[PDB]
Amino acid sequence: KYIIPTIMLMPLTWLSKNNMIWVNSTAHSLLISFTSLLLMNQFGDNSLNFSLLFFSDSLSTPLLILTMWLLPLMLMASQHHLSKENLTRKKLFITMLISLQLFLIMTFTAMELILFYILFEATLVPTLIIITRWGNQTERLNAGLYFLFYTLAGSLPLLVALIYIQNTVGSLNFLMLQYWVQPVHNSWSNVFMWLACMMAFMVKMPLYGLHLWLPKAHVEAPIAGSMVLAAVLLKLGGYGMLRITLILNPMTDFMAYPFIMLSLWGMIMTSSICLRQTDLKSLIAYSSVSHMALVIVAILIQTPWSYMGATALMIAHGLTSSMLFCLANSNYERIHSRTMILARGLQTLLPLMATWWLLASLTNLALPPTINLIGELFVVMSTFSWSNITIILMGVNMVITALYSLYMLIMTQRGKYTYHINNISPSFTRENALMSLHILPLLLLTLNPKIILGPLY
Amino acid sequence: XXXXXXXXXXXXXXXXXXXXXXXXXXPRLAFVGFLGYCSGLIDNAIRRRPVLLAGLHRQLLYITSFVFVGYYLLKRQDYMYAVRDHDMFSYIKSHXXXXXXXXXXXXXXXXXXX
Amino acid sequence: XXXXXXXXXXXXXXXXXXXXXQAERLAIRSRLKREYQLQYYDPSRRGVIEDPALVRWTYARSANIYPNFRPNTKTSLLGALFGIGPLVFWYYVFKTDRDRKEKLIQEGKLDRTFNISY
Amino acid sequence: RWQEDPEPEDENLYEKNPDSHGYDKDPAVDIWNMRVVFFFGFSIVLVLGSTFVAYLPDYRMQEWARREAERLVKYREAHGLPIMESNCFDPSKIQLP
Amino acid sequence: LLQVVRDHWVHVLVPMGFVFGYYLDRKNDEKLTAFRNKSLLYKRELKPNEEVTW
Amino acid sequence: RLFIIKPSGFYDKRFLKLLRFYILLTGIPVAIGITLINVXXXXXXXXXXXXXXXXXXXXXXXXXXXXXXXXX
Amino acid sequence: XXXXXXXXXXXXXXXXXXXXXXXXXXXXXXXXXXXXXXXXXXXXXXXXXXXXXXXXXXXXXXXXXXXXXXXXCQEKDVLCMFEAEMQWRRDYKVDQEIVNIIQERLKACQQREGESHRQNCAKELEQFTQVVKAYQDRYXXXXXXXXXXXXXXXXXXXXXXXXXXXXXX
């Protein structure tokens, strides 16, 4: 139902005339994104399989809807960029997004681990082409090579891990079939089997160790700022930790103990650096570490309460950090620098965009129940049942989550910009329309967060 | 099996075991047909010719050749998987002692806390 | 950091060396301002000015990492003890809490009957 | 020496030769795209899509379980002594050891 | 008539691809016809319609 | 009288009017959505006789609009 | 209705004898607002109910009963274990909202009495302590994520602990 109309977007951009292109790619994507909220939502007590195992059903993944939400949203801000260059260069880098969306639909839907693996690594190839090309600043290669040699270094151990499970215990396939899986006896040979399953989802889900993959990709901008949101889709795209820990190793949690603590220090120290940093895109790059680290802590506890907040945080972060990158892009195409201090001035120069700057920054804080409060609060409550000492460290993190976003506000809420003379037009219709399409879904999830937070809810 | 034991060595088709029935307009055949069409798109990029899709009508040769070779390739696929299953099921019945059945049991297992 | 007496006007002399010192500082200050002045007062510009000071300021933190840290000696090694060290510090904190909690479940109950969530 | 490498031009739509637009060039294409189909998805997915989300098609037995629980409470209280759960989904298991 | 067909050609293909996608993915249930009515979960005897529901 | 401070205003105020025009355009079936509860029957709870488990909608509750979406 | 316990009957009756002044300001405003915007709201609600005429009853609640015990068929089989685990997941979702009713029974006591709090009721306090304690041992709580395959182990661990204590005494 979802694959085939998404594949038919590929000949759409190539066959259409030279003056159009962007009109057809945006309009047809919006009607397909409507059908995702029409058919996928239906479920019973245990979510029943879709069809044959080419693409399967969703049990605890309404995160597909977020990919369908960014399916037209990534095409909006990429209008100002790429417009100067040739028509063939435009047609290629629109279809690379469609190819990304093709593989991204395949990752969340298909209830597998063997075929899921060759879709998890398959998303890295289109992003590699996007990140390495169109870089405004230099050191594109010091982020492009970093994009593979961190992920593939951790994910290639899945080939020796996943196949080892199916060769001993039946077959992986449906996961709904996986009741054959027996608890681990805790042996030294089984130590590296657990580590190989984890390490793939320890790189894309950023810790404190091996976290350097993320900020390098964000600072060195792929195209404008809307292709940065595709890298946000890859953080939440590593959702296999929800499936491996729950099924393949449920008895194993003794080896999780140091890895919780490694992500726990990736909260205080990741927030400390994000205070004196000069680059505006880097300030969102390090804030994205902490929010996804909260998910990492939640998964390894394995309590039924933590997953309720973990799945909610995947949707919460994917529409708020992407909203923040669009605000960084809206200054990047006017001032032509990622410097925070140089680009300073809201309301006096940017009147209506300043209110969007508020709502995006307030979502990093704990607002009245939208999705960010709902997502975070379950994790804090789950950590206390895990160990009572946690909120002494977790509370300090709550202080600097204010400093994550208020420092972004203060260094933009000042009536100066004496050196600057540009940025005459504050928002050319679509510039604010991007910001509304990011916040209004979060405002609609205030009334119904049952659709978002749902691992057996 | 790597080495032949029942079938005669060096043969293009099966012939000895022909009864299996080949696929008719299979979903796998459509992808190979798409690959034949894909080769007729990229050849106009190497040899610079107007339009990838609306170019020369030598593309029909590329579609047919991939389908024709692919049909014999898919015929070998369904044959070899069938022989693999035929040898496996015959091995269990001939030995009998190698396979053992155990069903319906209630056994204790350690439960994890938190 | 602050001393016993706060510096604002304390310890200053006219002399001859200080008189030429102010002449040096005002010369560069006027040199870097005039290149701004010629670029500020013209309608034909429209665009944010670069300035070599701010570009190098951003480059100081984002880059210049691997050309540095070649004489590590001892100061770099002391940073690792403050780096990976706190992870070892908390490793014995949570472990003592686990030995406290796990023993209470099996013998002498501490968990309340009202508890059901997580 | 750069020879041909030194080539850069500052481009901004703003208002000059655009009137009021978002997409670069052509006034006819801009209005039909940036104001019509850009806002058609804004009207269908957000307003007509709000009716769905979780409201209407029950959604993973949330409303069904409420009516199912209430009828089981009144029946078990009138007949049995234990309320709902005591020793559930296990009756006459084959030993322990 | 001639001006309308020449203008829109790629535009028609995307909703047409949805109908082709919906039809092909529905036909997969015909391969999975086994255990159509089994046990007590969603099983009822036929009155007029054949094989309850597809 | 003074010349006052200057803001784009024209680009800002037009966005809110263009947004509201498309909210109100699909705000018509929202207004019909209230009358669908009014005119057509909403919900009834009764023990069903053994004949059919599902007809049009398998389980319909609260709103009649739930049954209309269940058919397609 | 039916399921909810609640209080028997509330008294609530005013005498009004001490001080005439202006009779009662609370009673005069209550009688005025009953006719102003309460009787008019009752007339519109009755007009909409009468306009319905034809009403569909429908099935509402689904049956689905027993379908064999989960702790009887084992040895890892897809045809048998799938439907057995479905029954356990149904009951677990029902048991979540059974607790909610007993939880709201204690909520009703706190609202009605207020000043009495713990001195009265007692029945709702005892009903809460009996169910939740049994809920902790049988359904999840210490058994991590919800899984019916692991649920049999939690029942067996409680059965082994009870047998060990019975042998000593």
- Which sequence spans correspond to the domains of chain E? 6-54
Q: Output phi, psi for A77, to 5 deg.
A: -80, -15
| Minimal CA separation from D85 to chain C, in Å | 13
Please report how many Cα atoms fall inside a 13 Å half-sphere around the Cα of residue G127, on the Cβ side: 21
* Interacting residues of G94 by C-beta distance below 8 A, sequence separation 6+: D65, D68, D69, D72
The string of DSSP codes covering C3-46 is -SS--SS-S---SSHHHHHHHHHHHHHHHHHHHHHHHHS-TT--
Experimental method: cryo-EM
Nearest of A368, A224, A192, A376 to residue A293 by alpha carbon: A376
- Residues 27-56 (C) with a CB less than 8 A from some CB of D: 46-47
Residues 109-128 of G with CB under 8 A from E: none
Q: How many angstroms separate the CA atoms of A251 and B110, rounded?
A: 9
Closest Cβ–Cβ partner in A352, A424, A436 for F12 = A352
Neighbours of A324 (CB within 10 A): 28
Helices of type H across A22-177: 22-39, 64-76, 87-109, 114-120, 124-132, 141-148, 151-155, 157-168
CA A231 to chain centre: 6
Residues A451, C75 contacting (CB under 8 angstroms): no
SS3 A279: strand
- Give the end-to-end CA distance of chain F in Å, rounded to a whole number: 63
Q: Which of G94, G98, G97, G121 is nearest to G108 (CA)?
A: G121
User: What is the number of other CB atoms lying within 10 angstroms of the CB of residue D87?
Assistant: 13
List beta partners, residue F55: F57
Closest to B113 (Cα-Cα) out of C107, A182, A179, C106: C106
Contacts of E25 by beta carbon, 8 Å cutoff, 6+ apart = A1, A4, A51
Task: Please state, in angstroms and rounded to a whole number, the distance separating the CA atoms of residues C56 and A309.
Answer: 43
Q: How far is the first Cα of chain A from the last one, in angstroms, to the nearest whole number?
A: 26
Using CA atoms, how far apart are residues C9 and C6, in angstroms rounded to an integer? 9
At A99, is the secondary structure helix, strand, or coil?
A: helix
Q: Is D85 on the interface with C (CB under 8 A)?
A: no
Phi, psi of A279 (to 5 degrees): -80, 130
Are residues F1 and A419 in contact, defined by beta-carbon separation less than 8 angstroms?
no
What is the C-alpha separation between A228 and A206, in angstroms, rounded?
16
Cβ count near A114 (within 10 Å): 16
Burial of F64 (0-12, 13-18, 19+ CB in 10 A): middle
Radius of gyration (Cα) for chain G, nearest Å? 27
Taken in order A4, A5, A6, A9, is the CA torsion positive or negative? positive
Do residues A320 and A360 make contact, with C-beta atoms less than 8 angstroms apart?
A: yes
DSSP class of B1: -
Does F12 contact chain A (CB < 8 Å)? yes
Q: Which G-chain residues 22-81 have CB contacts (< 8 A) with chain B?
A: 71, 73-75, 77
Nearest-angstrom CA–CA distance, F69 and F59: 12
DSSP symbol at A79: G
| B-contacting chains (≥3 CB pairs under 8 Å) | A, D, G
Chain G neighbors of D96, CB-CB under 8 A: 156, 159-160, 163
| Chain G CB contacts of D65 below 8 Å | 93-94, 96-97
Please tell me what DSSP assigns to residue F57: B
d(CA A123, CA A112): 16
Cα D58 to Cα D76: distance, rounded to the nearest angstrom: 27
How far, rounded to the nearest angstrom, does the alpha carbon of residue G21 sit from its chain's CA centroid?
47
First to last CA, chain C: 48
Here the tokens at position G156 are 């067996």
Q: From CA C28, how far away is CA E43, in angstroms rounded?
A: 91
Closest CA to A423 of D13, G66, C107, C78: D13
Tokens of G144: 């991590």
How far is C-alpha A198 from the geometric centre of its chain's CA atoms? 18
Three-state secondary-structure class, residue C67: coil
Burial of G144 (0-12, 13-18, 19+ CB in 10 A): buried
Q: How far apart are CA A253 and CA D57, in angstroms?
A: 38
Rounded to whole angstroms, the Cα distance separating A379 from A300 reads: 11
The radius of gyration of chain E's CA atoms, rounded to the nearest angstrom, is: 20
Beta carbons within 8 Å of B83's beta carbon, 6+ residues apart: B1, B6, B7, B17
Instruction: List subunits contacting chain D, requiring 3 or more Cβ pairs under 8 Å.
Output: A, B, C, F, G
Residue D9 near chain C (CB below 8 Å): no
What DSSP assignment string belongs to A423-443? Answer: --SS--SHHHHHHHHHHHHHH
Q: State how far the Cα of A200 lies from the Cα of A150, in Å rounded to an integer.
A: 9
* Residue A60 DSSP class: S
As given in the structure block, the two tokens for residue A208 are 């404190």
Instruction: Please report where in the chains the tokens 């009996």 appear, as a residue.
Output: G130
Token duo for residue A113: 């681990």
